[PDB]
Amino acid sequence: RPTVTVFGADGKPTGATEVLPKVFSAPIRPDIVKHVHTGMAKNKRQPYAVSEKAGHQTSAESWGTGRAVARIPRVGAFGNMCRSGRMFAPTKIWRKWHVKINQGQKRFATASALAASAVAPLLMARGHQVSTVPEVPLVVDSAAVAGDAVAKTAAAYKLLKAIGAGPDVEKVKKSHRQRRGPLIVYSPEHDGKELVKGFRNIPGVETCPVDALNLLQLAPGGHLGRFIVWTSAAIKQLDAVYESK
Amino acid sequence: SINPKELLDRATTLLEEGDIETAAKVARTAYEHIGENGRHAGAALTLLGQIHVELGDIDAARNYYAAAVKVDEDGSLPEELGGGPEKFLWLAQLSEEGGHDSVAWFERGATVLRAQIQSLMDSLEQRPLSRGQVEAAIADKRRRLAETLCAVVEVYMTDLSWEDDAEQRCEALITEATMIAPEWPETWQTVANVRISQERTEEAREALRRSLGLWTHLPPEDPGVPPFPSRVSLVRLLIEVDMEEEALEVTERLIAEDDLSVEVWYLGGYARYRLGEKEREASGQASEPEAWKDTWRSSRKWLRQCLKVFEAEEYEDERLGEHAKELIASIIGEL
């Protein structure tokens, strides 16, 4: 039975421990998310569109490329508007008709991204600084965020330093759109909503409840390996929530 | 020995886990124990078709999907045995002639779908196991049909745009599609596509605003959110009819899902360039006369990043690559 240690606000192990949820065992496939969003595989010309077939006619200008073309000031002619009347000609969208497969792949991708989050080399490859993090997956005791513990911004920021998230939060401080920093995953039913009010103040860190986990946060830009801070309450439910959907 | 149907299920699970290589192996062995005369030949060939599509082997995919048709020419077999209408729709897109050949395949696919829809509805008034399940199944089927009609619309605005009854056929397709799936964003997206080419810009905007209102508020993984390639087409429509502000939001979400998408970096950069031109012309009447400069700065960042990913991926859209350069050089000259 693999288990993960839980840390207190002080930054040291509280002696307690949690069962490592099974989802972290899922096989890591680096380009699964990119695959879900791909048009035609290994197409380098127009991957999101079926190529235009001119037949015995002459191909329109805008065909075979993604670039906009010059256009005449706006206010039979229908076919002419299509070929040379538009900045962007109409295109045959590349449609992946086997929907259920694609849907299943999204589901697995979520598990695969969760697993990737608990692999230090993948996190560093995504540019997170995690050399100071004591353990992955990183689990904090929910007692440290039970209610108005980290409602204050000073208390939340102090918690991240002691847990080792400091260097990654400060990284962001150099030079909305903050998938670069750590993701705080919490259980709404037990941890509450107060902690969000404290973390929202901090730049870089992102907030999200366990039930509302998506690939945008777990795999920014379609790259697996998000730095995640779990609350003890969140870890326990985590295995049930993924199986629920 | 083992039942081949179990092998089909195994390969499907493997495919759904992104393990395409092993799926092809298991799907191959499966079909060998089924053959062309087998009960599950259609479903097996369909699966082998899906797999080779995901592999990027289009020519293998065409042969498998074609063989599936020869096993189930009218599509009357249950989806579980014969594969379903999917094989017709893929042959339409994979058609090397395109044009009339694609429409013919699409029509065959639409025919199968319409019959299945009608069958589910008869099964609805018949005492169902679950009314909710059937309505859901009907919805899914009507959406696939709507998307099929839209696919035909796009052939008539490209391959067969020289046809005299091109506009008439498109008008008939979008009326039926809005009838069967008025809640589906792609139908209204396609309505806008037609309108633009009809020089009906305001109605195009109206249609696009409607399609967006059906998904922009959804969570990013919800089945109601249109597929990536469909949202690329959307961005082109949005820049076309001067809704760059909306295009900016759509392009930012897309990059949050795949930041190795050359064409999306370009579209986002171009959308921001166009937006900057407008703000700049209105600069005299605007409150922030310098706002356009920041808008063009981000345009430059998107386009720089486009060329960067362009090189890294060894992209082959030369014309898009050269235009991105022109746009950057242009922004530079104007500071």
Numbering used by the authors:
A (entry chain A): 4 to 78, 89 to 188, 203 to 272
B (entry chain B): 27 to 361
Quote the passages of the study that discuss this structure, keeping the authors' original sentences:
We have previously shown that the dedicated assembly chaperone Acl4 recognizes nascent RpL4, facilitates its nuclear import, and releases RpL4 on engaging RpL18 at the pre-ribosome. Moreover, Acl4 is required for the soluble expression of newly synthesized RpL4 and for the protection of RpL4 from the Tom1-dependent cellular degradation machinery. Whereas, unprotected RpL4 is targeted by the E3-ubiquitin ligase Tom1 for proteasome-dependent degradation, interactions with Acl4 and Kap104 sequester Tom1 ubiquitination sites in the RpL4 loop and extension. Thus, ribosome assembly chaperones can serve dual functions by facilitating nuclear import while simultaneously protecting unassembled ribosomal proteins from the cellular degradation machinery.
Acl4 adopts an α-helical tetratricopeptide repeat (TPR) fold composed of seven TPRs (αA-αN) and a C-terminal flanking helix (αO) with an overall right-handed superhelical twist that accommodates the entire 70-residue RpL4LOOP with its concave surface. The structure reveals an extensive interaction encompassing 70 exposed residues of the internal RpL4 loop that are sequestered by the concave Acl4 surface on complex formation. In contrast, binding to Acl4 results in a great compaction of RpL4LOOP by more than ∼15 Å, sequestering a maximum number of residues into the protective environment of the concave Acl4 surface. Acl4-binding induces the formation of an α-helix within RpL4LOOP (α3, residues 89 to 97), which is entirely devoid of secondary structure elements in the context of the intact ribosome. The interface is formed primarily by electrostatic interactions between the acidic Acl4 surface and the basic RpL4LOOP. The crystal structure of Acl4·RpL4 now shows that Lys56 is located in the highly conserved RpL4LOOP and is sequestered by the Acl4 surface, thus shielded from Tom1-mediated ubiquitination.
